[PDB]
Design an enzyme around this catalytic site. Structure first.
Site, PDB file in Angstrom:
ATOM      1  N   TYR B  51       0.811  -1.275   0.058  1.00 28.30           N
ATOM      2  CA  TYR B  51       0.191  -0.047  -0.506  1.00 28.30           C
ATOM      3  C   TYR B  51       0.921   1.339   0.040  1.00 28.30           C
ATOM      4  O   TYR B  51       1.750   1.550   0.694  1.00 28.30           O
ATOM      5  CB  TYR B  51      -0.528   0.131   1.658  1.00 28.30           C
ATOM      6  CG  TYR B  51      -2.585   0.326   0.965  1.00 28.30           C
ATOM      7  CD1 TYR B  51      -2.435   0.676   0.313  1.00 28.30           C
ATOM      8  CD2 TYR B  51      -2.651  -1.249   1.083  1.00 28.30           C
ATOM      9  CE1 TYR B  51      -4.222   1.320  -0.489  1.00 28.30           C
ATOM     10  CE2 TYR B  51      -4.532  -0.885   1.061  1.00 28.30           C
ATOM     11  CZ  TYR B  51      -4.702   0.115   0.218  1.00 28.30           C
ATOM     12  OH  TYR B  51      -6.204  -0.155  -0.417  1.00 28.30           O
ATOM     13  N   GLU B  53      -0.342   4.796  -1.362  1.00 24.65           N
ATOM     14  CA  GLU B  53      -1.273   5.977  -1.269  1.00 24.65           C
ATOM     15  C   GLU B  53      -0.576   7.599  -0.885  1.00 24.65           C
ATOM     16  O   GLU B  53       0.554   7.707   0.265  1.00 24.65           O
ATOM     17  CB  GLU B  53      -2.675   5.685   0.217  1.00 24.65           C
ATOM     18  CG  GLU B  53      -3.543   4.878  -0.188  1.00 24.65           C
ATOM     19  CD  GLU B  53      -4.952   4.938   0.288  1.00 24.65           C
ATOM     20  OE1 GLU B  53      -4.749   4.990   1.907  1.00 24.65           O
ATOM     21  OE2 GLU B  53      -5.739   4.813   0.416  1.00 24.65           O
ATOM     22  N   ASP B 197      -5.753  14.214 -25.362  1.00 21.22           N
ATOM     23  CA  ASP B 197      -5.388  12.505 -24.784  1.00 21.22           C
ATOM     24  C   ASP B 197      -4.521  12.272 -25.799  1.00 21.22           C
ATOM     25  O   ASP B 197      -5.634  11.704 -26.853  1.00 21.22           O
ATOM     26  CB  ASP B 197      -6.964  12.901 -24.875  1.00 21.22           C
ATOM     27  CG  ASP B 197      -7.492  10.814 -24.386  1.00 21.22           C
ATOM     28  OD1 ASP B 197      -6.206   9.983 -24.262  1.00 21.22           O
ATOM     29  OD2 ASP B 197      -8.444  10.520 -23.966  1.00 21.22           O
ATOM     30  N   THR B 223      -3.122   6.653 -22.155  1.00 21.52           N
ATOM     31  CA  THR B 223      -2.324   5.476 -21.667  1.00 21.52           C
ATOM     32  C   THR B 223      -0.860   4.903 -21.844  1.00 21.52           C
ATOM     33  O   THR B 223       0.031   5.777 -22.717  1.00 21.52           O
ATOM     34  CB  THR B 223      -3.406   3.938 -22.102  1.00 21.52           C
ATOM     35  OG1 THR B 223      -3.113   4.559 -23.805  1.00 21.52           O
ATOM     36  CG2 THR B 223      -5.144   4.664 -22.694  1.00 21.52           C
ATOM     37  N   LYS B 226      -0.916   1.261 -26.253  1.00 17.64           N
ATOM     38  CA  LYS B 226      -1.339   1.406 -26.784  1.00 17.64           C
ATOM     39  C   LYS B 226       0.495   2.295 -27.514  1.00 17.64           C
ATOM     40  O   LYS B 226       1.150   1.114 -27.692  1.00 17.64           O
ATOM     41  CB  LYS B 226      -1.954   2.264 -26.869  1.00 17.64           C
ATOM     42  CG  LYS B 226      -3.291   2.361 -26.103  1.00 17.64           C
ATOM     43  CD  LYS B 226      -4.971   3.196 -26.140  1.00 17.64           C
ATOM     44  CE  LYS B 226      -6.316   3.179 -25.977  1.00 17.64           C
ATOM     45  NZ  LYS B 226      -7.166   3.635 -26.194  1.00 17.64           N
ATOM     46  N   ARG B 232      -0.634  -1.967 -18.730  1.00 14.92           N
ATOM     47  CA  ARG B 232      -2.456  -1.753 -19.039  1.00 14.92           C
ATOM     48  C   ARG B 232      -1.892  -0.381 -17.694  1.00 14.92           C
ATOM     49  O   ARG B 232      -2.294  -0.619 -16.839  1.00 14.92           O
ATOM     50  CB  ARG B 232      -3.103  -2.563 -19.353  1.00 14.92           C
ATOM     51  CG  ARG B 232      -4.839  -1.714 -19.105  1.00 14.92           C
ATOM     52  CD  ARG B 232      -5.585  -3.441 -19.564  1.00 14.92           C
ATOM     53  NE  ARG B 232      -4.923  -3.791 -21.198  1.00 14.92           N
ATOM     54  CZ  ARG B 232      -5.545  -3.188 -22.870  1.00 14.92           C
ATOM     55  NH1 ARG B 232      -6.697  -2.661 -22.513  1.00 14.92           N
ATOM     56  NH2 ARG B 232      -5.000  -4.047 -23.224  1.00 14.92           N
TER      57      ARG B 232
END
Lengths: 405, 405
Positions: B51, B53, B197, B223, B226, B232
């Site tokens: 974790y 955060e 984008d 992304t 691609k 991903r």
């Protein structure tokens, strides 16, 4: 690893550091666990190369015949595990699982009732700096000031006064069993939907050591990591009547292509949870939490709610005149990983706190038992009662190293 | 794989099917690629157990010293690759990257200007069944009916009329170079923020084969998969003045804990993109797209915009009296993977379409060159001009098998 060490020495070195850190430290962060090598292999698979927007048999793109099998395996294993009518295994995280349910049943500015964030509620349960508190009108219910158990009369009064469209139950730092039947009863009284966020307790639910929210809730959200001991990601369980709307909320609602390699790992984790040995693991988690709680009390520590029904406990540090921040920092020096955590009615800010949160899921996975719980509590006692003694901290350091081999 | 085959035969069998499928088929879906074994190893690492955060050096939990190095490596490599002042590598996907930028600069119901979805715009650029179209007031600009090139006078007129707070540029199915300078000029005229984008073209930007939006846009989303050929996930690039607000939008705004194992893989992919051989790869992608376009025209196919400047092309199937759905289905029968795609001013619905979208990024990764592009186009010609001939389709099938070995 074969190709990463050669391709990227820098990234490999940092990963190898992290791997050794995970073994060397005593991990007591209540949300942490260690996944199996099988789960990791599934996440390290070629399924990352496949776009699979939509759902099994109803995909946007062709070529999904095999990733469809993977997703259905995950969904069916999830349904078998929790007795749910419908599962959506596409949420990227717990945050996105929650987000999609809010997107399903609420309009912008709708009133929602959740657990007080300083009493155990999660960031996505109405924080004013989170999308939940910004997009919806969150009101909070609290725990009793003496028992630190959810005040169900306060849940009921807050629901009858504010008339929420949705009631959220469940927590990030609540050490007792939640009464989902009472939540649904209150929800039925005011005509609200009931959502249960079981992220923390999900593995205990699967093993029958915590009451199952599924029969009482319209929606159940969870992480696949934490007590469930799976990959990092989210999941939604719901009845058949919301299945279509929930699926639409995830895609095309709030997400795009799912992470099929993570969904593969979800399936693996669910397969593991269906086995008898996971049930035995989960009992040891709760048994260890109980023992640790008891041993901490024996050291002179006050615990929020006076103990635990689950995997986690909260130490109220006020009697030792320590903040959670100070405790967190000094334990970090000896190799024990906790997080500072607000206690109910905390006089300190969330950035300082009067408590530390402790969970046993991670140390139980590495095979710690009752004797180890006694020792951990003894080390915590040694550290926190002698914060200004470097000899005490060195002794603690060595005793931590003894536990981790 | 060692432990997954024994732990989970069912999941392993499906993955192994998918692995063989990926090799056997000719993958022409424009968003697809194949990641390196190093990237996959990073995703299959123990970093899923942590974790983290918050951000490097400013985490919510302790023990993040090494995952911090990983994230900074990703951010710094991203900044070196695109010349951006700030990067956020935590977005779970392209959808979440976009969501966070909208969350940063917009209030609920604000007017936003994006590319017509049936002209190449993405689902997250204003679809009424997506959070974007539901949360904000999206208006659209279109391409010229003859050239299929973005009509910048229409972008300007729509901006001056509707007065959007944000203009979104970039696309899922636009085969020509986007003029980001003109977008910023229009944005400056109406006092709007500009978001680009670049998800589809990101790898071509990194290799200098498409103009870089970074100098002209307030925010750039993408992304990591691609054309960039990474894992991903999503990413946000922006100038220093928005760095704090963008970071806050991701956490505690719309996400929780990041996927550190995926961020590790992002770093690996960025390291690969910084190397000379990726630049050579990316040129071959565009060269192959050009050759494929040209060869398809030679077969008698009409292409949207009359060709391509990038990795992708759109076949306008109307002259062959075929829908994109029919074409998609028959090509699937021979082992060629495309997706049906709406063409500008399409008389058919998005569920039927008058076109197929084709991209070369995936086949170029497996080493296809100009000779392979000629053959693929010849096979597509054979299939689509003889849809009712099983002998033609069997010949196509065998010629596909010849290409994939």
């Amino acid at each position: 690893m074969k190709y990463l060490p050669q391709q990227d020495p820098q990234v490999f070195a940092a990963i190898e550091q992290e791997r050794k850190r995970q073994h060397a430290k005593i991990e007591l962060i209540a949300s942490e666990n260690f996944v199996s090598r099988a789960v990791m292999e599934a996440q390290g698979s070629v399924l990352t190369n496949k776009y699979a927007e939509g759902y099994p048999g109803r995909r946007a793109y062709g070529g999904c015949e095999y990733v469809d099998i993977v997703e259905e395996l995950a969904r069916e294993r999830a349904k078998q595990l929790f007795g749910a009518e419908h599962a959506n295994v596409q949420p990227h995280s717990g945050a996105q699982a929650n987000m999609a349910v809010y997107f399903t049943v609420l309009e912008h500015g709708d009133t929602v009732l959740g657990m007080n964030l300083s009493h155990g509620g999660h960031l996505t349960h109405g924080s004013p700096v989170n999308f939940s508190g910004v997009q919806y009108n969150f009101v909070a219910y609290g725990v009793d000031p003496e028992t630190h158990v959810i005040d169900y009369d306060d849940v009921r009064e807050k629901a009858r006064l504010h008339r929420p469209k949705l009631i959220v139950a469940a927590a990030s730092a609540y050490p007792r069993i939640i009464d989902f039947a009472k939540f649904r009863e209150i929800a039925d009284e005011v005509g609200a939907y009931l959502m249960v966020d079981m992220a923390h307790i999900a593995g205990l639910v699967a093993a029958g050591l915590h009451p199952n929210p599924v029969p009482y809730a319209h929606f159940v959200t969870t992480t696949t990591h934490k007590t469930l001991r799976g990959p990092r990601g989210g999941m939604i369980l719901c009845q058949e009547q919301f299945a279509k709307q929930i699926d639409k909320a995830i895609f095309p609602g709030i997400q795009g292509g799912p992470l099929m390699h993570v969904i593969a790992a979800k399936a693996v984790a669910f397969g593991e949870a269906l086995q008898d040995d996971f049930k035995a693991y989960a009992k040891r988690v709760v048994d260890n939490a109980k023992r640790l709680a008891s041993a901490l009390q024996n050291e002179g520590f006050t615990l929020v709610s006076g103990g635990t029904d689950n995997h986690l406990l909260l130490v109220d540090l006020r009697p030792q005149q320590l903040t959670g921040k100070t405790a967190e920092k000094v334990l970090d020096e000896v190799g024990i990983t906790v997080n500072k955590n607000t206690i109910p009615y905390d006089p300190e800010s969330p950035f300082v706190t009067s408590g530390i949160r402790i969970g046993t899921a991670a140390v139980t996975t590495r095979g710690f038992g009752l004797e180890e719980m006694d020792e951990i509590a003894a080390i915590i006692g040694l550290v926190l009662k002698n914060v200004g003694s470097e000899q005490a901290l060195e002794e603690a350091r060595q005793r931590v190293a003894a536990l981790t081999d």
